[PDB]
Chain A
Amino acid sequence: EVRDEVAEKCQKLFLDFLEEFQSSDGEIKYLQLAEELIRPERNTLVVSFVDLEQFNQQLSTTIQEEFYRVYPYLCRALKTFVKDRKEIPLAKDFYVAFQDLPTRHKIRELTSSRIGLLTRISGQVVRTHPVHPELVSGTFLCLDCQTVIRDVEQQFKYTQPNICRNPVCANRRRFLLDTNKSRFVDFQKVRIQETQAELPRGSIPRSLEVILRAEAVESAQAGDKCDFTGTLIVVPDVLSYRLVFLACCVAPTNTAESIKNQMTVKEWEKVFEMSQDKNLYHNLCTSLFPTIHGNDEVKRGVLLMLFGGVPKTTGEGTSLRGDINVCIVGDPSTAKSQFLKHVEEFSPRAVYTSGKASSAAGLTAAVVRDEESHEFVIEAGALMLADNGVCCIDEFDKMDVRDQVAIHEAMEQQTISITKAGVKATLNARTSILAAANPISGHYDRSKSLKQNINLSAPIMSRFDLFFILVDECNEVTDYAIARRIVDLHSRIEESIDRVYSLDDIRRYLLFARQFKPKISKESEDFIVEQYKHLRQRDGKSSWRITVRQLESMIRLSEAMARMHCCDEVQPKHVKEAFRLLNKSIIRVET
């Protein structure tokens, strides 16, 4: 019976804040939030840290300094507040989730000095373990003296009572666990790593284990980037200890009007000029690919991929792909890997990988036994790591059949349903895929159909928006120009590039354009119809036939081109240019 004056004062002030603090409307927002919380599956209530800081700066400072110490008392305050208010179940777990924390530390900055205090970190999930109930406040009975030990809290380990409850008896070794009376809570072990944004060049990322509980258990899926608000703590491991970030709340990491308001005056002026800049298409292509010659169509397609179309979900719960997939089949050399490397370097969220990767993930989500825990864990693959980004996959022709089928499913349904060893999950993966491949035998036989030239399965080929064939022309002028480019690059170590727009400018312009969702005008509709009429009438011989899949790719490219200029509606110019691109990408047999 020892009372922590700090804990009691914090509990009192927290309850006062809950029952007095009100929104701009003058009503207690948290009253309505809790009223929502009464519903089943809602056992966690979010709280705005800035709000309580305004209500009581001292209270916020104390909670930040000693969040872990006071958290149980905050939970008790929430329990008291909710119990007496409405018809909530008499006894079910409740929790408080904190957000709006201005201080965003890096995994590098998590030091032992920060143990026990609230903090927010940003990372990328790598693997996720199965949910498991865990005893938090165990209850035991002494065998000799048959007295029930209660509320013997365990610090994340099988901590039996030190000695019997009875002063008379000193069994000390034969306590029996009362499973029914024991208090359990559902914990999930996740692993996170430094996001590429914060990752120093050529530095191994820091892997941090986190514990998810209550509403946050299933919030974070493998391969996604998320921000966790919680507190770093220590856990004994077989006086050894290891660090784990117990996260109270999990949120996704970080509208056009919102971005423009947030964007600086000079940056917004530059972007506005870009939108008003005619011929921005070719200018941006050339700026983004300085160390390349020719292959203008490849650069056009890559840029259109970078922008992307408008995803659509039907009323019947059917997802229509919004992003496009590009493949580049090329003779030896010809700068394919250079294209992929440029795309990866320029664009954040773009990940480069090879079809020869031997990782257990194997370029997609997998299930693997942990070396220590020996429990199956869903490990995210590179394709997952490219979530809402780009996956530049090289040696695409050399992928394994296992990864081949996984990638086929991913690009077909835009999600990967992985079930094995009793574990099951459905990982969302909306990732544009830029694949590089070599013709069978090394050199592309232009007198043969594309199928005969590559080993990719028919479904993979069908589900690709654009195929770009790079044939090593024997023309002297082309080779002379390529030599000129390479030699100028190597001699003029820098300053050889002529970027009409800076890389950062291109990145911010792409982010601004993403906010638009161009619509299709009835004029655009009929123009698309007529273009597909012509494409079908062509009916040739072409390497691969033309199906409605090509029409879908056409409309997606048209959406991307509309996004190029940021116009919110489609015009015949975009449709005709997309038709030109797709039709040119088609290669006829030269026999």
Chain B
Amino acid sequence: SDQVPVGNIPRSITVLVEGENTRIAQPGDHVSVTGIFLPILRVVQGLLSETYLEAHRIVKMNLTREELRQIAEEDFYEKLAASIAPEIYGHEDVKKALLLLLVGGVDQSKIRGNINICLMGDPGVAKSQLLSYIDRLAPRSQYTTGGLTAAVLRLTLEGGALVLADQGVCCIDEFDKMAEADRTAIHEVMEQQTISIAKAGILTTLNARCSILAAANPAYGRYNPRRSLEQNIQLPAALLSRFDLLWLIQDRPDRDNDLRLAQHITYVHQHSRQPPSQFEPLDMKLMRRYIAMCREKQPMVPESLADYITAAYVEMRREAWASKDATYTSARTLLAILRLSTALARLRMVDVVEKEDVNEAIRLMEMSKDSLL
């Protein structure tokens, strides 16, 4: 996806592997092939033939000072959040969560490093645009609407979008309109990071380790606050509980906020650019570079911080029990807290998590649960 032009789609080349090179590649593998490009004749002004690539070697592949100074800035992270789709006014915390997803977990050993996020909201709140922007910014990206999972074409395995993610990010718009089988598949993806598929009674397991960014709309129109979750939406509650972060976006008519949004849109239409902000949004390439730099690190969690993390967890769980409506609190929540903290540590380029990161993760989690208010 890196080499694909912005306004085009990936192209395919058939490769004929033979000899010892066989059984050296799997679907979804980001590989490099050295071989001879030759035609296969399986007649306008000459013969016409289909081409292939006779493989010979297959190998599975895996700044300036001012840049570092900017990285050292405390607002640096916030700045990056502002750069996530600047034209999308508001949703700052949502953008921050998306950035955390983009930087991912650490998987210190192993821990599932993917940070699955879901955005449930009324129609017309920029969800699809956000998903598209993430697909454009994440180095390895897939976009889908609901195929997603692998298939057995007739006799060849064909990786679905989920497989093509393979440590990338799979942005699934219109999540609420996904087939039940697909729901089960994504459940398995979030549980083991593998896809099990069987067409002729053969359970084949493929490595699909990819963060999931889902978007959904409440059924029967806009979300009804008086109706509990899964009442305005038709998704299994457990599946939602799987996601590390679940954000509810409500298009509440607020004259002030609505006016602000209108002003923003008008400025865009009158200048083809978003209104000027405190920090100019960074170019996508630079964002990707910083993301990769963050992926370099694998910060640790000092045992001392454990005490505070446990305290926070017990506090929030007690609050949830005090809350009349169950807020999906469970060990999953603690795991997500840890993942978010380590992702923030990656953003800080510090191999040791800090109180700051834990507090920020807790704040994001609280804000999601409040968004369900």
A/B touching: CB–CB < 8 A = no
Which residues of A does B touch, CB under 8 Å? none
Interface residues of B (CB under 8 A from A): none
